[model samples]
Target chain A: LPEESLFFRELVKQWRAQDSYGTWEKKSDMELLAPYVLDKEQRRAIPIIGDPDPEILWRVELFYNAVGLATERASGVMVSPMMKMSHEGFGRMVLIAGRLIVVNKQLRDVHRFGFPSMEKLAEEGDKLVAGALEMIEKFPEVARF
Target chain B: LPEESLFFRELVKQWRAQDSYGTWEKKSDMELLAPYVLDKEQRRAIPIIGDPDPEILWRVELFYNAVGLATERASGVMVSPMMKMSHEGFGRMVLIAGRLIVVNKQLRDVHRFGFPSMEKLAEEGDKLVAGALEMIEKFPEVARF
Candidate 1:
C-alpha cells in the first residue's frame, strides 16, 4: 500500500487490538490519556441496542477509510473553498452520524442501521464526485491547486 | 429548543427535502449546482446491495436528531481542548463512516450494517464523555477556547 494508506492500515490494526473487556485490567495513569478513557458510569449511560459483530466493524473501518482518503486527497491538492466546503459539508454530516454509531450500539437495530440509508448514502457519493467535478470545471485553475 | 439546538433543527429540514430521486428532472446552467446532479451512468455505479425500504431512511434521520441533540448539549458550555478533541474525534470518525454509508451502500446488507461495530462503537461513546470530564477536571481553562 502507498504511504497515505499506511496510516489507516496501522490504525485498523491498533483498533482491532483494543480489548474492550480487558480495558479495566490495564488502565493508563497519564493525565493526557485520561481525556480519552471511559469510566463505568459513563459506559452505562450509552446502552447497547444489539449484539456485536466484526462485519459491521469492518464496514465502519471502510467508512473511515473512504472519508479519510477523500479528505487526504482534497488536502493534498489544496482545492478551492467551494470544493473544500463541499467535502467538509459531507464530512461533517458523517461525523454527526458516526457519533451515534459510536454511542448507540442499539441504535443500529432500532434504526435499521443498514437498510434505509443505503440508497440515500449511495446517492451522496454521486453528489460528492459531481460536486468536485463541478468545482473543477468552473475553476479549472483549482484543478492544479 | 435552546439557541444552540437551532443549527440542527434547520439541518434536519434541509436533509429531508434533498432531491436524490428527482434530481434528474431538474437541470441547471450554473456551475456550482452541477456537481450535485448525478447522471444515469453515475447512478448505475452506486448499486444497492439488497432490497430497499424507506423505514431505514426515517430511522437514519431520527438517529441523527438524537445524536445532534446530545452534541449540541455538550457544546452549549464549551469544554477543554481535550474534551473538545474527544467529541470532534468521534465526530470525524462518523464523518468517515458516513462517507461509507454514502459511497458503498452495497456493503450494508452483506455486513448487516449495525451489528459488528455496535459493541465497539458503543464502547467509544463511553470514552467520549469520560475523556471530556477528565480534560475539564485536569485542565479546565482550555474549555474557554
Candidate 2:
C-alpha cells in the first residue's frame, strides 16, 4: 500500500540511496522504515527532553526532501526544502517554489521523530504534498515567479 | 502501560461510565479505546472528505473532557472544556480555568479523529495537561480569577 503513494516511494528511494557503503541494500523497505514506526513502547523509552542525534536529524531532512521532490513532480515546479533547527531540535521546515512558501511546519521533539505505522507515515507525506500542490494551484504566478 | 498514565485511566473510566445500559462494562480498556487507535488500513477506509458522524463527534468531546479532568486534578483548578464545532466538525477546543485560556487547539477533519496507539493518545493528553499546568503556575492570579 505504501508503494502506491508517490511520497512513500520517494522516501524509500532517497533513504536507501543515502548509504555510502550500500549497508542498507540488504534491508527490506519495512526494515529501512522501522525507525519511523515508533510504537508506544518505543516512544516511551526515549527521554522527554534531550538533544536530537545526528541520525535523527538526517531522517528529518530526508522526510522533507521526499516531500519537496514529490511536490515538484506533481506540480512541475522546482521546490526547495529549507530547514532551520537549533541544537535542541526545535525549528521550522518550509518548502519554497519560486517566491511562494508552499509548505510550512513547525518541528518539535525532533529527537523522537516518528509515526505510529507505515500507513500513517505515507498518509502524512501524501497530505503535505497535496497541500503544497493546492497552494501552488491557488497562486500559480507566485509559485512560478 | 496505559494503566500507568493518569490520563489514560481517567479516559477509560469516563468512557465506560457513559453507557447507561452497562454495555461497555464487559469490554477491556484496550477494546474500549480501539476507536482511537486508527491504524493504516482502518484510517484509509474512511473517506478523506466527509461530514463527521455523531459518534465521531462524541468521541472527540470525550477526549477533551479527559484532558480537562486531568488538568483539574493536576492543577487543583476547575478546568472547563469549551468546544465549538460546526456541523462539518471543524472548530476549536479550549480549556478555561477562571480567566486563563489554558489549552487551545484548532480541530480539523473530525471525521477521522484518532491516534496511532494508546501510548500516543496518552502522551498527547498528558502533554496538554502538563502545558496547562505550567500556564496556570505562571499566572496564578489569572488562573484563579
Candidate 3:
C-alpha cells in the first residue's frame, strides 16, 4: 500500500512480460499478483506436508529470478539464479554474479512459496539485492570475473 | 511495491485529508511516505539514545491513529486510541473498542517510531486490525457498550 519500490516495479514489469498471450495486460497488477500474497489464513488452509505443484514452483523460481534481476540492475553485474529442488520441494537456491555467490537461501515448504503481503515481497527482494550489492562491493574483482 | 491494501489505501487518504492547505496534493504518495521508511542504514545513523522530536512523535501517533481507523472500518465499532508518553519517549498505547481493550502495546525507543519499509508498515497495521477484529468477534457483547 505504500509506494512501489524500484525493485518491485521492475518485478511487476518482468512478471507481465512473461505472459506470451498478454492475458495479464487486462488484469490489474493486484489481480495478477494475487497468487503471491498468501496470508496466514490461506497458509493455514493448505496442508503442511504436501509436494509442491508446478504453479508453486514457478512462483518460487520467479521470485529468485526477480531478485537476480534486481541485483544485476543495481550492481551492473550479470546475475544468474541456480535453483535445485526435489519433487518434494526441498533444496537450495543461489544467485551468482560472475564468480560470486551473491545470494544463497535454503528452500523448504515449497508448496507455500509466497509472502503474507506485497510489502513483505518487496522487502525481501530489496534485501536480497542490497546484500548482493554489498557482496559485489566487497569483491569487485571477484564479481568482474 | 505491491498493490495497496485496503487499510493502507485508507491510511493514505486520511494522511492527505489532514493537510487543510492541500500542500501534499502536489507530492507523490511515496514522497509523502518517505519519512516512515527508515532502512537499517538510516536507523543506524540516528543516536541510540535521545528524546523524540515532535515530528517523530507525530509520526508515532499518526501510525496508531491509522490503525485505530482501520480497526473501526473493519469492525464497524468506534475505536479510540489512548497513547501516554513521557518527554523521554516511553509509554504505552491502547486501542479501545467500546468497552474492550482490543489492542494494547508497550512503547519503547519512541524516537525510532518508523518501520523499515512500507510492506512492514502495512503488515503491522493489518495485524493490529485483524487482532482487534478477532477480539470484537470474540466479545461482541463486551464491545456493544
Candidate 4:
C-alpha cells in the first residue's frame, strides 16, 4: 500500500468512532473474487474410486486396520495430526450400545461397555465391541453405529 | 490423473527420483501416495497472494514504481512472456545494464538488440507488452548498446 499510514488511519476511524459517513455492502452472490481468478484447487479428488493398483489399495486398507487395532489396544484416540484447526470441530468418539459412534462433546457419552450379562466389562464389551467390529468386517457396508 | 497419466507419470517420476534422474529420466513422486484413499472432510486454510484476507505478507507488489521512473523500465522486461518461461534452464540470468538481462525470441538477432526500447513509447502504451521497452528505458544504467 503506497499510503499504508493513511489507509490504516481511515480504517481505524471507521472502525471506532461513531461517524456519520455511510457504509457500503453488496448483495448475495456478488463478485467473490477478481474478474480473472483461477479455479479453486480441489484437495482430494480421485476420479476413479476403486484404484487400478490393487497393491496400493491393499496397502491403504492394511494401514487403516493397523491403526484401528493399535488404537483398540493403545490409549487415547488416534486423531490425525494433520487435521485442520477448526475443521471437524475436534472429532472424538463415543460408544453407545455395542458400536463406535463418533460424537463430539456437548453431550453424547462414549462407551467401551458391552452387554452387562457376562462380566459387566468384557461381557459388556464382548457384545458391543464384537458387534461393531463384526459389522465392520462381515457387513462392511453397515456404518450406522 | 488417468487422463494426464502420460505427462503426470513423467512428471511424477522426474519429481521423485531425486538425483537418480533428470528431465530425461522418469521419477515417481506418487510412490508416497496411496492408490485408494478415503475422503476426508474439507479443511479451509488461510490464503496468500490473491486472497483478500491473506495472513502472510503476500509475495506481491503494488507496482514497480509510482510515477514514470527508472524502475518502471526494468519491470517491463521481467514481466514479458519470453522471460515468463526462462530458457536459461530454471534460474541462470544474463546481465543487462545493471538489471538482469531477459531475452525473448522477438527481441533476438534481428533480435540481439537486447531489452525493448522505451525511449519513445507512448506514455499510455501498455507497460507490459514486451521486453524491449524496459531494456531501452534502462539503457543509461545498462552498460551495453
Output the lDDT of residue A104, model 3.
67
Ranking by lDDT: 2, 3, 1, 4
Better model by lDDT, 2 or 4?
2
Clashing pairs in 3: A4-B1, A119-B119
How displaced is residue A22 in candidate 1, in Å? 33
Q: In model 3 chain B, which range of ten residues has the least summed lDDT?
A: B1-10
TM-score of chain B of 1: 0.27
Q: What is the lDDT of residue A73 in candidate 3?
A: 77
lDDT per residue for candidate 2 within B22-139, as digits (tens), equals 8888888889988888775776677646567878878888888888888888878987665666447476666667645677677877777888888898898888889888877865
Candidate 2 per-residue lDDT, tens place, A1-145, comes to: 8888889988998888888898989999889987888886787677646678888888888998999899988879887666666447577676767645678677877878888899999999999999989878876765675
C-alpha lDDT values of all predictions: 0.31, 0.79, 0.73, 0.25
Which candidate number maximizes TM-score? 2
lDDT of 1 at A129: 37
Q: Please identify model 2 stretches exceeding 4 Å from their true place.
A: A48-50, B1-145
TM-score of only chain B in every candidate structure: 0.27, 0.90, 0.89, 0.20
Clashing pairs in 2: none
Better of 2 and 4 by TM-score: 2
- Any idea what lDDT model 2 has? 0.79
Specify the CAPRI tier of model 1. Answer: incorrect
- CAPRI docking class of candidate 4: incorrect
Candidate 1 scores an iRMS of 17.2
User: Candidate 1 chain A — worst ten consecutive residues by lDDT sum?
Assistant: A80-89
Candidate 3 per-residue lDDT over residues A1-145, each given as its tens digit:
4236656776777778789999779898767767889788887677646578878877777777888887777778987666666446576676666545567677877776788988887887888889888877866654665
Tens-digit lDDT track for model 4 on B1-145? 2313222332233234434535423423433212111122211221222322221111001111111122234343322111111222121112222222322222111111111222212121233223334444434333231
Better of 1 and 4 by lDDT: 1
